[PDB]
Amino acid sequence: PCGHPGDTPFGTFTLTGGNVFEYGVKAVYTCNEGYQLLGEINYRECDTDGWTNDIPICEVVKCLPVTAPENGKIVSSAMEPDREYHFGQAVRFVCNSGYKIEGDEEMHCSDDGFWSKEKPKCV
């Protein structure tokens, strides 16, 4: 009777209350592995007027732009002209002339919005 709130490519949505698009049901959106919700609103509630809220914002998980190790640099500097570090992206690093990497050379962006590998050193 409400219809269908919408569905997000970024994530998923679930229906709480009636498990359908009936009156009184809350379409609670939930992001997927690699996405996070943006904003406080995560749900749409079907009132007699229809769905109250709109489709919430689900943004892709971005991991903060790593600078570089001390005696090294980033390998994954290019990929896009936009280049945000989204989930799935592996930031690989390379050490300069005469330096060897202390940790591992690659770091992935996980759903946590945090880097999976630690920033390695070049010593």
Question: Which distant-in-sequence residues (6+ apart) come within 8 Å of 98 by Cβ?
Answer: none
Question: Using the 8-state DSSP alphabet, how is residue 13 labeled?
Answer: E
| Joined tokens for residue 84 | 């945000």
In the chain, the amino acid numbered 105 is E
Count of helices and strands (H, E) across the chain: 0, 9
- How was this structure obtained? NMR
Kindly tell me the sign of the dihedral angle through the C-alpha atoms of 74, 77, 79, 84. Answer: positive
Instruction: CATH 2.10.70.10 in the chain: give the residue spans.
Output: 1-60, 61-123
| 47-52: long-range contacts, CB 8 A cutoff, minimum separation 24 | 47/23, 48/23, 50/2, 50/3, 51/2, 51/3, 51/5, 51/27
The CATH-assigned architecture of domain 61-123 is Ribbon (2.10)
Quick check: helix, strand or coil at residue 109? strand
| Polymer length in residues for the chain | 123
How far apart CA 9 and CA 29 sit, in angstroms, is 11
How far apart CA 119 and CA 114 sit, in angstroms, is 11
Please tell us whether the domain made up of 1-60 is placed in CATH 3.90.226.10.
no
How far apart CA 107 and CA 115 sit, in angstroms, is 6
